[PDB]
DNA sequence: ACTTGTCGGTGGTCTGCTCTAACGTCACGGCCAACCGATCGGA
């Protein structure tokens, strides 16, 4: 599904914008999708969705003063999505654990990350 | 008589409120009170009821209740 | 309008509701569902949208309106929606740097990218 | 390729209609209780 990926991307992009104070345009255009051209087209579509009634004060808001994209109204969308059962989380955990490289982040990074991810899931 | 509390009497009043179950939802006793100021909720404890010993005037909130409203234009 | 707009509006509406919203109210209230020709096209489209949302991972629960109401509606548990807290930052940098290096299977790379994006949306 | 509307189906709950073959057969639970004047229908 090529729509589901976009939907998940937006559902994570809104919390990302609300959690990084005044993120510049380049950081968003390089992190969430390399194509910065479609970033504006995705922001335009995000500007149209909001709470039922779809009046000002219900749709999500923003400030394009310059490069910084800040969100003033989120319409309840503040937290990211939960890592789906197995799937993404399973693959990430498997890759993190089955690494065939001699330990370099083993002391307090790899094991800590594994334990924290397992507890979070 | 006023100074020495000769003809002075104590009168006790009882106010009771119940949170029932309605068809549109359930009624919750809490200190949320959608549209009020912040100093009105100063004598209410964590569970939304006044504190013992707190002086109450006319119109002061004793128990904070709220009911489902439904969809209204 | 657009399918993505319908999905986003439905997600937001089901997130912000307090009681189980029935499908009849979903048709009139949520934008994009009011352009259907008849009640069967809307029903099938809403069923497909529910299937997609449930398969994605978003918790979409179906239950009664209330005790004294026989209508059946839908909600989204905001508490089960995700887990806010995150751990340290140094380990996450190593995890991201090793997230994907040579894997070619589309499912694996898409899953890793989704996990990385969710981690970025939950801090770095 | 993805979406979408028409087609068809399984299963479940709320609501309404019909039927049941020994013989059976003419209601109660209860005062009213003043006390005046006016008036129509009986005797």
From Swiss-Prot, chain B:
It comes from the Bacteria. The RNAP catalytic core consists of 2 alpha, 1 beta, 1 beta' and 1 omega subunit. When a sigma factor is associated with the core the holoenzyme is formed, which can initiate transcription. Interacts with RbpA, which partially restores Rif-inhibited transcription. DNA-dependent RNA polymerase catalyzes the transcription of DNA into RNA using the four ribonucleoside triphosphates as substrates. This subunit often mutates to generate rifampicin (Rif) resistance. Interaction with RbpA partially restores Rif-inhibited transcription; once the subunit is Rif-resistant however RbpA no longer stimulates transcription. Mutations in the RRDR sequence (residues 423-449) confer rifampicin (Rif) resistance. Rif blocks transcription initiation but not elongation. Belongs to the RNA polymerase beta chain family. This is DNA-directed RNA polymerase subunit beta.
